[model samples]
Target: TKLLVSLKVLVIQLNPQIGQVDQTIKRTWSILDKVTKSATYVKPDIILFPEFALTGYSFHARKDILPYVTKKDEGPSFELAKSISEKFQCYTIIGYPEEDDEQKLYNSALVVNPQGGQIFNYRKTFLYDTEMNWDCEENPEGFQTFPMDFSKCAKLSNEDSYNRDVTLKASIGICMDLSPYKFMAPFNHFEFSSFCVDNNVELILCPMAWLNSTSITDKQTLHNNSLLEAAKNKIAFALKEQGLPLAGSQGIYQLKIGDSQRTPRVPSDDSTSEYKDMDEPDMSNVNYWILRFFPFLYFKLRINWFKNSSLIESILGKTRMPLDHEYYKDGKLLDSEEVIKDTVLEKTFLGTSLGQPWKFQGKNAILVLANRCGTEDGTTIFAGSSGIYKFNGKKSLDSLNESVELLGNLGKGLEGAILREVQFEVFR
Candidate 1:
């Protein structure tokens, strides 16, 4: 077997309050604007936002959260995604609240492609009863996969820069879809098992709203609560057993139990350190100013329309959209202005697949395993998970008691995240 392609991807472990649809959507755009601006200068091939991102879990009744729901064709959230997708020219996957044609509410995920079409949408199949009762389940309909044709890289988009021969397939699964410990009996196998054995799916995306458990009293009890760490090991086990490379956040809410005291847990401050930069820029203030003071004409008359304009490209001095490529030779994170400038230079002079945008020569999988980021408040951590520790720069996977395998990659992986670039074909 030969290596086929390489795709750049990103995952955000976001934090937002329950039932706050507008705020969540705003938060998403703000985080992405910075990520694409600073780190991967070019938009990522695909970006995954955590499950129930738009609507927090733990609502009382369907109607309670319905105000936050949206139809695919209607609503500010959907339109914003479309706007960003076309602007960035990248695939954006987000977990949202969907009100189907029948008017039933479901916990859903939507994938809006660079072309501005919502190509795929999926609802959670597995549910966490009390929390899940607020939403409906979708058909077991096997799994969903879409064609990822890198051939559409820019208006320069074509098969010339990619393998051209091998086509990539991607799939979307919600939080509990890959659960190792299923609450039910019959359908207990890891769904991704099929994704590996039958589907030939090269990329799998999961959006999760995973939280900590409240009953746990000790550190191990809390650490054991990470569905993320658990899922990582599960993917590794599958890679060993079925032998395939496979891969795969947030917040709190209110509730009143049935005749139970419901022991209230004190809310953590708005953000862990309401003050410290925490190595993470607090975009809340930036988002505030931009949303209020920034004018629509700046968007309509300026950047949006001229995003791909040759005059604007020269003035701004960069390609308006993402150009795919393998990581730099020295194994640096793809977050520098110089890295993108090289691609601009190549497109200007070489004008072919001769420079930074050349095809990849190896078989690799880039996986980002993250806990929570700094913007999130403490309430997001539950079940004795590492909440007691600070999410400052001083934090390490070891401090969070994460897996050793992840800790070992800290020195070599991308900044602000762990990116594992493995050569699976070698093992084959």
Candidate 2:
């Protein structure tokens, strides 16, 4: 039957431009040695590294470094990725480069299942200035996923980490592909399952040659959020999922291009403290859960003033209700009265947010929901309170906590947000 699933992936946070192969190989060997050892403590189903883990990204020269990328079929790196499935007997996903008989190169990611020699590839789509940065291939349709039938991948209620035991599905995308925000795109999902639908998928592995800059955090967070959103809104039938962006410091983050072991260990928790707090509420050692806030399809919506109607040639229209077409494909928006009416309709169904579907339990569970910000409350049709966090301003969390006394914040996260390690207490 269908239930919540969780996964643990290690993001190898490092730079690829500085490390060389023989050296990167040895380094990857050491890192994997450390990870596999400590990993028995955690033993994540899959461990990944930053993009271009093998050749230092070699942005300085394109053709000169093409050979450094790994192949999809068989090799030393493939041996490493496959061995994870072999040694640990789990699904090991790795991102790398694949060369064709024509000598053309393509950016690709592969999945190795311990059961046997079942391996497949999903190439990168959406080429950008960065693709040229490292001579990677660009095939927009290559976006697809494979499964890592492990249980540690599922979230909630008596699930073990190393026990994923079925053909759980997933997709793979590279560095630049994240920018497309193509979760809504049709053909994109089918290669893995359905370009328009998703089912039984477990993880979304993204191995890319991320640049050295501050934008890494934003990209990482956004990508993770997007993956959750897709799993919820689009592929609601799936168990659990994650976006492992093997992004790290400038040049030191991979073992071998195909070595799943070298794929800089991107793991389960990679979000801001505030975001994590959203998941952790009822602080309890007895059960390890906090305030029980019902999860739902909550969203912050906006009304278009049409400041510049490049297409419609009109701006000041005033039917500001949940039916605003901009947020959805077929003009579906949210409102209060409409929601009450639906509640009256008594038709029960689940609503998606990101990773899993929110069930409509009689009291605690949430169904349809949305969050509107910086817009006017024009209509009352779909008027109902659905856990909205009203933010009066758009300033960063740090600024708000800093300038406004009383609120506590140490600031910073692993990615775009401050990489924070924190704890909280609850009182009853």
**Best candidate, TM-score:** 1
RMSD of each: 21.6, 17.5
Q: What is the lDDT of residue 269 in candidate 2?
A: 28
For residues 1-428, write the lDDT of model 2, one tens digit per residue.
Answer: 33443333334433233334566556555655555444234444455444444544334456655656555776545676676567666555555566767676766666676664546776766454545655655563434545445543333234433243334455565555543233343221122212212222233445544321212223444348665444333221111122212221222222211222210111222232111121121112101000011111121221121122221211111121112222233333234344433322222111221222222111111011111000011100110011101111111112122111111111011211001111111111
lDDT of each: 0.40, 0.34
Shift in Å, residue 379, candidate 1: 7.6
TM-scores for the candidates? 0.51, 0.47
Candidate 2: deviation at residue 201, Å? 4.7
Tens-digit per-residue lDDT, 1-428, candidate 1: 44334444555544445655677666666665555445324445555565655555556677777777888666765776678778777677777778878887766778787898987777665555434556565434434567655543222123334333334566666655554324443231233423322333445565655433211224463356584455445334422443222211222211111111211122233552232322232223212211221111012223323333433233233222112211122233233554554433333211111221211212222222222231122223211110100011010112122111111111000113222211121111
User: How many Å off is the CA of 79 in candidate 2?
Assistant: 2.7
Q: Candidate 2: deviation at residue 365, Å? A: 18
